[PDB]
Amino acid sequence: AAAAAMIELDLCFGLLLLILFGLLSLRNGHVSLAHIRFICQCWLVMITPLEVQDFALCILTVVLLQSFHSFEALLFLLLAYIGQLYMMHSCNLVSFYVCLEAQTLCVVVLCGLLARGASTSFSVEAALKFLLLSAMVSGMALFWFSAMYQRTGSLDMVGQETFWILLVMLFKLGVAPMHMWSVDLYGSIPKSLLLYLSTAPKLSLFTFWASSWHHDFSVGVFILFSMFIGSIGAYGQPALRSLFAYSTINEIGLLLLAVETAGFHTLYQHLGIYIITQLLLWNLTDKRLFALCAVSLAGLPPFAGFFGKAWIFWHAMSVQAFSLLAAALFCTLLSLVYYLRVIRLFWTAPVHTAASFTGAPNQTTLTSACAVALAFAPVMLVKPFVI
Template sequence: MNSINLAPVYPEIFLVVATSALLLVDMFLPEEKRNITYWLALLSLAVSAALTLGDFNSGATVYTFNNMFVSDPLSNLMKLFSYLAVAIAFIYSRQYTTERGMLGGTLGGEFYILALFALVGQMVMLSANNFLIVYLGIELLSLATYALVALRRDHTVSTEAAMKYFVLGAMASGFLLYGISMLYGATGSLDLHEVAKATASGTENKTVLVFGLVFLVAGLAFKLGAAPFHMWSPDVYQGAPTSVTLLLGAAPKLATFGVCIRLLVEGLWTLAIDWQQMLTVLAVLSMAVGNITAIAQTNLKRMLAYSTISQTGFMLLGLLSGVFSGSNMDSAANAYSSAMFYSITYVLTTLGTFGMIMLLARSGFEAENIDDFKGLNQRSPWFAAVMMILLLSLAGVPPMVGFYAKLAVLQSVVAAGQLWLAIAAVMFSLIGAFYYLRVVKAMYFDEPVDNSQIAVHKDMQVTMSANGIAIIVLGLVPGPLMALCVAAISKTLGS
């Protein structure tokens, strides 16, 4: 019997063991020592990051568990940014969760434990090389996030949001599983490389393949929150505790992007013409629905949910530009790396925006309406400046990183010969700039409705400031991060 190489799975194994140990430790902690759970969770992320960094620096592609699990530059880079996103989310959420009793009483440290288990699901998704492993990772992520949304059991809006998320999520999982079963029926394999070979042979039933592909893309579109599968996003973003909304809007986006590369580009590249058309429709609908509907929103969390939908549309533009007939490997790698750069920088930006909502919130008060940001410049010029930087980046205003990310995606779209798509994306971005600038106007030109002092922990203050500065620095010097993305994509697709 052949021994299994466990080295590529060390980060996942460690995080599962550490999270399970954290659950046991937290059970015996008195309420006044809940901070120990917070620091241990951050320590677990740091050790996992160190293990993954070693794999990433080696630059090797290693398969294990009969080729069902792969450790390669793409998965390792996205895991590193997932750790960073979850760590920032923990720092931003610390004060918010404590004030709302989410860490006290019978709940304990469930917020951290569920978030870490969700992260394990994301790691499995990123390294999956088999349809069943993809599904396993998605379900581990989904089950943990369902529980997170419903964490405040005495909060009616949260439980309603969790129920909507669960019902629609179950339907999306059904779509995904049905699509996988159709592809298995057509190709006779669940291994992504074997599926790629079978579809390339041209002997399989094309109708069955495309039928399965439709359901597969629909399931992925739900997980990304792309229109018209976006129905859950606004309600869940608004109804969930802001700390959970922050988690939902961050790291899972990176994992879903990785799964799209795995399934569509590595496994089903011979059906690119078919899934490109689907992604084109999803991208245009997402940009239209997201940007136009966001204009009518007064709740900032709901507005940012529609913003996420529109940003997802932009990311899909990079994905669909990579494998056009006649395009070479270099242009494909540039398109995918631009989409990867976009997803990473968007996550860093959205972490800051939801973090700012929690920064202004206090016990018994949720600062989630646009009116709550009125006159922020008079209360705290520095935090108003940070929020403005984040919003301008989402709008794609130079020199913020959002501008460069949008430009890189648009370049790949134009290079693929889809000029009309690039023009549509620019037009929708101009519409989107309105609702971002409306918040900036409220912060700088309106009188404050709340003059209370903003009191935040030092770690959140420092992290929030670093977050805002990073958005400008990455916008001015995007080369190193883009080079990392290009190298990760090129090495992964070339292996």
């Protein structure tokens, strides 16, 4: 009986109808597609199950779709969402491989498609490098899956070959020293895909890790590499895109410290606060709120980034992971300097914000002003909330 699979049939039927509707709308010469975007958001809601993580991903992708305008980009983001959703439910390396590869192909094509102006060739260059680096990591995953399949005779993810699969997962999160594909991507690709790349796949992969993964090894050297390299790199790079790429490497090192000491509640709290800050960061038009992102990414006390860092520090001290904790505290002391550089650049400066001329007047002030109210979330964060 197939009566337990109506959501899958609904997914496929919705894709079949959406392609035909997008074709009919384009035969009329419509230069805007807000109706297509609303149908895409409805389809996103209709295929998502009733778990916390699934709906967090769903609501995140509904918010992200407001920064994309063409039909093909919307289709690629939907088919990347299918991989992102179904990776959280993957209990093998077969589905794991297919979901990861679908996401990689969608990201590569979007990086090629959306570039404009003088930065087109730089974006295509960085997309090619990302594709080549992704191909060999995919080959490593397939090779060691074949080794595990031959040794165990089954699809269980146990044994020594899980160390290389773990390295595949660490590549997909931009963990140093395999971090330079993300550093290349941050310097050229436009802001909407940078917003997409810093939020949704990290959530999808960490939920797969929380749900169906065990390894008998450690990730401590990659924690050290990510934290020290990210902090020193963001201290040393004057371009703002490289600053935010290296600060992202530092944040993924903190999330790996939360993974390594168990306690995924602190991981989920810090990831949620980080995702809301990212949603504020890449949609800013008034540059004074760039200082709020700075004080809430430096871990300064009353804002929500402090709470996200401080439960990670608390659980690390609870299980006595002293050396990694000391390295994390040193890199936190270093991170403050370049977040202060951000504050010097964009707060202690005269205010200029250009008006719109061709309509759409400051079109994402709702989301940015809503996400700035991360100064009111700390009242709920101090309680036993995320567990």
